[PDB]
Amino acid sequence: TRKTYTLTDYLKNTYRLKLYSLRWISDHEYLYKQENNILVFNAEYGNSSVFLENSTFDEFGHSINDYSISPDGQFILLEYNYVKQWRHSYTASYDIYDLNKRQLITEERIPNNTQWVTWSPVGHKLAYVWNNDIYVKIEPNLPSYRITWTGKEDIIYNGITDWVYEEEVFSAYSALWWSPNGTFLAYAQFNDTEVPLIEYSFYSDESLQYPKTVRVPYPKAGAVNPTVKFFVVNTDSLSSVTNATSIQITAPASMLIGDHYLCDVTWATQERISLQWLRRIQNYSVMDICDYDESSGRWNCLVARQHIEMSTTGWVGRFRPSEPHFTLDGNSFYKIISNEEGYRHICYFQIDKKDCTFITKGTWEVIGIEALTSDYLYYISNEYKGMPGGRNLYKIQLSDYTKVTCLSCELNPERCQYYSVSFSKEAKYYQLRCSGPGLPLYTLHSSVNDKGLRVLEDNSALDKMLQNVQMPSKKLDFIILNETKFWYQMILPPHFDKSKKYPLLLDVYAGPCSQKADTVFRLNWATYLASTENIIVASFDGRGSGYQGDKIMHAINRRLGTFEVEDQIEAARQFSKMGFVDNKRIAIWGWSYGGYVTSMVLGSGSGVFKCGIAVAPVSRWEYYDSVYTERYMGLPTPEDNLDHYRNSTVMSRAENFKQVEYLLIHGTADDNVHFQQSAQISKALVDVGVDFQAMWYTDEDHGIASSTAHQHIYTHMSHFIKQCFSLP
Amino acid sequence: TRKTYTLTDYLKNTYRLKLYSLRWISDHEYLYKQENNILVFNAEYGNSSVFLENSTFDEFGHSINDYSISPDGQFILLEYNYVKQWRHSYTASYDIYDLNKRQLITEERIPNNTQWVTWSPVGHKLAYVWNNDIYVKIEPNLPSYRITWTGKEDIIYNGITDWVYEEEVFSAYSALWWSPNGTFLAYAQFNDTEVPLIEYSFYSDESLQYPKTVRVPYPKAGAVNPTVKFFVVNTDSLSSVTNATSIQITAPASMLIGDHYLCDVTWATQERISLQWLRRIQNYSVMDICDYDESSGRWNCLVARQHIEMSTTGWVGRFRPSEPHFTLDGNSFYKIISNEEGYRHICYFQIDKKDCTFITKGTWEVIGIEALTSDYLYYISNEYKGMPGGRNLYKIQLSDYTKVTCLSCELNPERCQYYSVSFSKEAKYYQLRCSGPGLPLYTLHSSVNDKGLRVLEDNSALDKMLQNVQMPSKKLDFIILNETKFWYQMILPPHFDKSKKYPLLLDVYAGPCSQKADTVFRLNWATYLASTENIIVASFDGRGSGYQGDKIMHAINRRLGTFEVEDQIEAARQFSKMGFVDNKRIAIWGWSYGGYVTSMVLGSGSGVFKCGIAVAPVSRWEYYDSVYTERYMGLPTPEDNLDHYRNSTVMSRAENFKQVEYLLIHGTADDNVHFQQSAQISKALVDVGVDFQAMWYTDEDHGIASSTAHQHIYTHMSHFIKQCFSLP
Ligand SMILES: CC#CCn1c(N2CCC[C@@H](N)C2)nc2c1c(=O)n(Cc1ccc(C#N)cc1)c1nccn21
Ligand SMILES: CC#CCn1c(N2CCC[C@@H](N)C2)nc2c1c(=O)n(Cc1ccc(C#N)cc1)c1nccn21
Ligand SMILES: *[C@@H]1O[C@H](CO)[C@@H](O[C@@H]2O[C@H](CO)[C@@H](O)[C@H](O)[C@H]2NC(C)=O)[C@H](O)[C@H]1NC(C)=O
Ligand SMILES: *[C@@H]1O[C@H](CO)[C@@H](O[C@@H]2O[C@H](CO)[C@@H](O)[C@H](O)[C@H]2NC(C)=O)[C@H](O)[C@H]1NC(C)=O
Ligand SMILES: *[C@@H]1O[C@H](CO)[C@@H](O[C@@H]2O[C@H](CO)[C@@H](O)[C@H](O)[C@H]2NC(C)=O)[C@H](O)[C@H]1NC(C)=O
Ligand SMILES: *[C@@H]1O[C@H](CO)[C@@H](O[C@@H]2O[C@H](CO)[C@@H](O)[C@H](O)[C@H]2NC(C)=O)[C@H](O)[C@H]1NC(C)=O
Ligand SMILES: *[C@@H]1O[C@H](CO)[C@@H](O[C@@H]2O[C@H](CO)[C@@H](O)[C@H](O)[C@H]2NC(C)=O)[C@H](O)[C@H]1NC(C)=O
Ligand SMILES: *[C@@H]1O[C@H](CO)[C@@H](O[C@@H]2O[C@H](CO)[C@@H](O)[C@H](O)[C@H]2NC(C)=O)[C@H](O)[C@H]1NC(C)=O
Ligand SMILES: *[C@@H]1O[C@H](CO)[C@@H](O[C@@H]2O[C@H](CO)[C@@H](O)[C@H](O)[C@H]2NC(C)=O)[C@H](O)[C@H]1NC(C)=O
Ligand SMILES: *[C@@H]1O[C@H](CO)[C@@H](O[C@@H]2O[C@H](CO)[C@@H](O)[C@H](O)[C@H]2NC(C)=O)[C@H](O)[C@H]1NC(C)=O
Ligand SMILES: *[C@@H]1O[C@H](CO)[C@@H](O[C@@H]2O[C@H](CO)[C@@H](O)[C@H](O)[C@H]2NC(C)=O)[C@H](O)[C@H]1NC(C)=O
Ligand SMILES: *[C@@H]1O[C@H](CO)[C@@H](O)[C@H](O)[C@H]1NC(C)=O
Ligand SMILES: *[C@@H]1O[C@H](CO)[C@@H](O)[C@H](O)[C@H]1NC(C)=O
Ligand SMILES: *[C@@H]1O[C@H](CO)[C@@H](O)[C@H](O)[C@H]1NC(C)=O
Ligand code: NA
């Protein structure tokens, strides 16, 4: 008999998915790491050479965390002493290695505790952030030029984001943007002076006698937000003037009237920059297109070039307004926007004309614009077979919009329905990354003729290994609720027999624009639960879910904790109606937003669920951050949406937890969903006399991702689900 | 068939022990609160009068927390707006009611947020502390005189203790001591300037958007301690024009050489005060005897009147050097000290002579000195039948030490083996309080011929109720280890059958000077476990336990987490070999020091215990406070006892928890045993991949004593023990 996919298989990563992570260095070459050696590959022929031998830094004296080769290939940035901060941020030490001289640079070194470092996009200039101020080095061995003097820990951030902008706006720590040829350095400045601090204990190693109090400027819903300013400095003037001026570009009057955000920065040309601003009430955004005026040395944003993007049914964008993709001359751009039917499609704009032209349309959505050449625009969409959970690459002819080719749809239609892509520098080549429903498959292609050059990684070693394992299967389908198709997936036990009654675990995210029903192949906890424990692990995309139009996505506008919660309960009732589910053994679990939904479901009094697990849940919207929460909820004021903020807490449903078995889990150093959130749930349960199971994770954050805590949490949850389902 | 004593009976206090709490106001009368009315009783006859009608404050507009009648009976202090702080500390608002003129005083009121208030011992003067400064009111309607001006929140404490002195030295918030007739007011001043702060989150009600950080000056072992100064003010010479002069009494030179504590303040006469000082290395203490000098207005402490108390085997006193009991002229005193055999007995000292004379002797100990007349000294000891867990009242004839009479031994030997006493003002009468092995019994006696005047409360109503319940029994016996007898108790299920095998729960404290095997009658969680669940609840007093001499008590000197842990394992090993114990079902549980011991036992790798519960445990001695920890451990420095501090942690035993089921519980707002202690245990268990059960209690402190959390914790622990013992 074949073994199953066990909990230890998952926790020890016995069955490893092979990747093919390349780094394009030009229009025809990429870097790839093979046995710690950095190899340079010719895309056209597949032949390689050792770019940098694995032995090069044996006598360095520090474990190198990562590297970054300068665009001109003259230098290599070596990252070490990596200390993680939030989701994207960290600090590190850096050394620069001169590739020509084959020597490490020992003078004018990047300082220790550097927050961010980036090469210019051409050549080898560097911009870095140290002690919240920006510095620029024209040459790696030469002194830096200081750009800002206002940087102050927890107060003024120059060229780096504060907590909320990193997490919710930019999805990056960096707040600097070099112009295409590196002449200008644009940057944002955040002022957190009046932003309140979240404070929590950090216990550290057992040697630490007194716990440390971590204090982070974090605006919770309705609190004082950081303010922002935007500047542009001419780096070519640094060696000629004592103190080069940072020219401010002010937000438009329509934004200055109240609280707002800087939400996008995109250079159009060497002398033209676009900026998108978003009002704190996130249903109104403004794009400014600003040109360098050589005579005044100023940046001017013509009102004739200003573009408004607004929503009457919800917020702007999926999580924020989309980025524009400028044509080479910078006189026009493409941008994903919601059409009149509420479907996200590519619109083509002239910079000084307000009405745009849609180049795509249909009851499906464009996911992202991937590359733009003088003749073609390349994008990813879920158009294929009307499957919102699938992803394919398309090519549209710019001189004829009726000419749309699907580049990936038919490559391996059984194995591959979810693609991502990586284009070379001027889009001459593209790597396709298939992530499911079969094993991930990485292929290289030439853009000149769309021909498949070679298979880079097919995961054949893993396929051989899995043949000896009783693997679960995955069913992806839909149910029709009120004449609308709603997609679901099920991880089915091996030898799934529809005449048998199986226990069911509902795996929930269900946040706005979430998608849990897709074609991706995963080896995770659900793989184990279905394979070894014979549990069906189901997920459902209800109202509020993404990639299916605004009528679905905006259904939860101003009403989080309503339809998306009700639709999970309804999904479980629909799954019971299918005949292969034991109705006495239905459980629900989720993390973060999934934890909030799990808890809301468990407190609903539905009687559908026996048990559930909430990991790092939100419990009350006033505890979560301003940017994310207010996007869907508006402000927690009597004049706005306070009544709904108060009506959608987990705590108010405490009495209903008497009907279920609940497991509540949270990391004590969670800077994102504060431990406070679960501390308030537990107190409300204790207050009504509800028994439940709990687990805190000392010094773990939102990811509970340290090697030991990851194994501990999944082991603890596995025992809980098994006990709930009477499984030995 | 009769009911058992259930978990709800324990949680809802179905079966209540009646008390008889009286307050002596003279040598012949006492106050007793009956039906919210305050009565005055004549001790000789038992007749009473209403002192204060319950209706007097029906229109007060505030709920009265407590009352305090002035010594002369002219005024009543009304306490309201009570806000608990630590174990003893709190703030409240106060009003004074004139009993003669039948009116509330509205002039010069005691301020709100008052920290401590006390009447003088005679008359009706008041001393109070507000904003850390001392104030004196000569008359209730008159303005206060400000005594101190240096009071500063968390820094300077005048007349009130800081955290560590409150918890570990004085067992009180008060640091004020009126002279016997109220002329002088002595006070301590604490300086916490350089004491580090423990910081922890407080979540508060769900309405609080950002958690509060609580910051408390708390010296952990080896950290900077508070400093102390002592002063005496003459309250008869205060002026409305001039600031009060406080006379400082400095510590002796043997204390000033290094860190030290003020550990006892006891007035001897109207013009003589005794002070005890303790070195930070708590095996050396000095008593100073200080006399007022009428000519100079100074307090002089003659070197010839100094008394040294030291220990070569351990620390001084049970928890601190004992209090002296001065004679009427203050020329001599009686004090409990450890004799040459290591047994605590009464020594008689002359104020100006070094050698004291022991008035009691034997292999048993004096618990406390209770009253002193020119002819007799009254004390409690465990002499009777050589039972260290029993307590009786004795009197010793001061002119002939061979004449010792037991006053309580034979009153009711079957019902009463554990007594406490309350004497009237000049010891003319005494109230005996029997607390076990039978139901509590309160009696009143006259000292002249030791007549048993009357029964005050016999709990016959509870006895009638308990007749219909299947109550557990208590067995008190001993085991012999290395020629020494060590006592244990077992709470045995009703209808106990020695031919049956019962699961056993070891209930542990086992800290230095602990005593868990005694003759006290209790209605607690153990009563329910034995009565309803048929579990034997055992407790054992091994090495380090009290009231049996220093050979046993000092056995754990500089070695916490050694013999007391080994001895609990040895006792359970011996119990597991008894015919009526199921060796497959032995559990252990404890709170605080008992939580530490439970955890150390569970991590010992003994294999005797299936499971256990640690509530608010200490996990590493460096995390606990200086005063308690260093008393037994010395300093955590390489030159002193750092190696033992490092090898006595729970965290180092984490791998050994693989073979046990463990439940770890802690309140998040524990200011005493910081949540940090359990946060480090859980992290060590996660680090070694050991699964365990946990429960945090949001905003609960060391007591986990709110009505809802107390019910929740005992409910959660009951489910855990029942699951462990395969009980339905
Ligand atoms: C509270 C909250 C929230 C919503 N949130 C956001 N957004 C957009 C990005 C920034 C972020 N602050 C908010 N992205 C995600 C969530 C979320 O809950 N989950 C569910 C989830 C989370 C963690 C794990 C794990 N491990 C598993 C499922 C998730 N899975 C894949 C992506 N996301
Ligand atoms: C950490 C530690 C410790 C030692 N500690 C101290 N001392 C002397 C007084 C001041 C204090 N800081 C230290 N007194 C006690 C303890 C102790 O652990 N328990 C066991 C226990 C504690 C709480 C509960 C409850 N609920 C049950 C048992 C206890 N039961 C009755 C009195 N004590
Ligand atoms: C991939 O192969 C090509 C062709 O064999 C290499 O290109 C160069 O070809 C010239 C012919 O004029 C040879 O003299 C050189 O060896 C090559 N130039 C360089 C700069 O190396 C090419 O280099 C190969 N690429 C890799 C990454 O190995
Ligand atoms: C960051 O914003 C704060 C206010 O949120 C600014 O601080 C004010 O600065 C002015 C001087 O121009 C003072 O007169 C005010 O007292 C300050 N207010 C507060 C609340 O501190 C600050 O200047 C901004 N800093 C930068 C570098 O823009
Ligand atoms: C470079 O120029 C900036 C901008 O004028 C100077 O920043 C000013 O610094 C002084 C403090 O000495 C203050 O008066 C201003 O509030 C600052 N303004 C801004 C926008 O930061 C800066 O100090 C200059 N650096 C040098 C070396 O002269
Ligand atoms: C990259 O772009 C900048 C901006 O267009 C170029 O700088 C301009 O170059 C022209 C020379 O052809 C001059 O007329 C301007 O004075 C320059 N402007 C500024 C603001 O510096 C720059 O030369 C380009 N760099 C490279 C390396 O090609
Ligand atoms: C208890 O009874 C005695 C009498 O046996 C009371 O003593 C008296 O005191 C009151 C005034 O307070 C007078 O009425 C009598 O003249 C006293 N008689 C004697 C013999 O002293 C006493 O008041 C009662 N005590 C209480 C507290 O009610
Ligand atoms: C104790 O607190 C109360 C309430 O703050 C004070 O009582 C007065 O009550 C009303 C409202 O309850 C306030 O408007 C007044 O300011 C209060 N002042 C006076 C002078 O009556 C009270 O004064 C406080 N007591 C002391 C002794 O300070
Ligand atoms: C309380 O104790 C502190 C010492 O912890 C005394 O403060 C001063 O301490 C600093 C160092 O913290 C020294 O630089 C000074 O010389 C000390 N004395 C003075 C007069 O500044 C502090 O004075 C004490 N306070 C009281 C009211 O006794
Ligand atoms: C309490 O004791 C004090 C001190 O013994 C008494 O005060 C002394 O009283 C006599 C008057 O009879 C004077 O000779 C002294 O000068 C006083 N000493 C001080 C230090 O003030 C006081 O009378 C007693 N109080 C009561 C109410 O009995
Ligand atoms: C108080 O206890 C201390 C610690 O046990 C005793 O310390 C002596 O002095 C040093 C500590 O710095 C050690 O080197 C010695 O080993 C100790 N002497 C012994 C164990 O005899 C100190 O003697 C104690 N005081 C009394 C009065 O016994
Ligand atoms: C970084 O830290 C190390 C260790 O303290 C030090 O020797 C070195 O000079 C530092 N590097 C820079 C660039 O300051
Ligand atoms: C933005 O949102 C607020 C709250 O829903 C609303 O009153 C306002 O009209 C909205 N703007 C648009 C363009 O719908
Ligand atoms: C008493 O002392 C305080 C504090 O030092 C001072 O401010 C006040 O002026 C003094 N009053 C008199 C009457 O000396
Ligand atoms: Na009698």
mmCIF file of C-alpha atoms and ligand atoms in Angstrom, chain B residues 167-168 319 509 591-593 618 624 628 673, ligand 2:
data_model
loop_
_atom_site.group_PDB
_atom_site.id
_atom_site.type_symbol
_atom_site.label_atom_id
_atom_site.label_comp_id
_atom_site.label_asym_id
_atom_site.label_seq_id
_atom_site.Cartn_x
_atom_site.Cartn_y
_atom_site.Cartn_z
ATOM 1 C CA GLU B 167 4.292 42.736 48.525
ATOM 2 C CA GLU B 168 7.405 41.309 50.238
ATOM 3 C CA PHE B 319 9.808 35.701 55.758
ATOM 4 C CA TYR B 509 2.904 25.009 47.041
ATOM 5 C CA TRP B 591 -0.224 28.230 41.545
ATOM 6 C CA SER B 592 2.629 30.803 41.761
ATOM 7 C CA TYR B 593 5.563 29.052 43.636
ATOM 8 C CA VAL B 618 7.718 31.437 38.241
ATOM 9 C CA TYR B 624 11.074 37.380 40.120
ATOM 10 C CA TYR B 628 11.659 37.360 47.950
ATOM 11 C CA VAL B 673 4.695 36.862 38.579
HETATM 12 C C1 LIG C 2 6.137 33.395 43.280
HETATM 13 C C2 LIG C 2 5.982 33.064 44.736
HETATM 14 C C3 LIG C 2 5.822 32.712 45.876
HETATM 15 C C4 LIG C 2 5.659 32.335 47.304
HETATM 16 N N1 LIG C 2 4.331 32.753 47.875
HETATM 17 C C5 LIG C 2 4.234 33.565 49.052
HETATM 18 N N2 LIG C 2 5.194 34.503 49.382
HETATM 19 C C6 LIG C 2 5.098 35.189 50.717
HETATM 20 C C7 LIG C 2 4.092 36.409 50.562
HETATM 21 C C8 LIG C 2 4.459 37.353 49.354
HETATM 22 C C9 LIG C 2 4.697 36.576 48.049
HETATM 23 N N3 LIG C 2 5.180 37.443 46.913
HETATM 24 C C10 LIG C 2 5.680 35.400 48.281
HETATM 25 N N4 LIG C 2 3.112 33.318 49.734
HETATM 26 C C11 LIG C 2 2.536 32.320 49.066
HETATM 27 C C12 LIG C 2 3.204 31.953 47.897
HETATM 28 C C13 LIG C 2 2.720 30.920 46.974
HETATM 29 O O1 LIG C 2 3.242 30.614 45.937
HETATM 30 N N5 LIG C 2 1.479 30.290 47.396
HETATM 31 C C14 LIG C 2 0.844 29.220 46.547
HETATM 32 C C15 LIG C 2 -0.448 29.775 45.963
HETATM 33 C C16 LIG C 2 -0.560 31.097 45.451
HETATM 34 C C17 LIG C 2 -1.779 31.573 44.964
HETATM 35 C C18 LIG C 2 -2.912 30.684 44.968
HETATM 36 C C19 LIG C 2 -4.191 31.072 44.447
HETATM 37 N N6 LIG C 2 -5.217 31.384 44.029
HETATM 38 C C20 LIG C 2 -2.816 29.381 45.450
HETATM 39 C C21 LIG C 2 -1.583 28.935 46.001
HETATM 40 C C22 LIG C 2 0.839 30.645 48.606
HETATM 41 N N7 LIG C 2 -0.288 30.122 49.101
HETATM 42 C C23 LIG C 2 -0.602 30.762 50.428
HETATM 43 C C24 LIG C 2 0.501 31.827 50.642
HETATM 44 N N8 LIG C 2 1.341 31.639 49.453
#
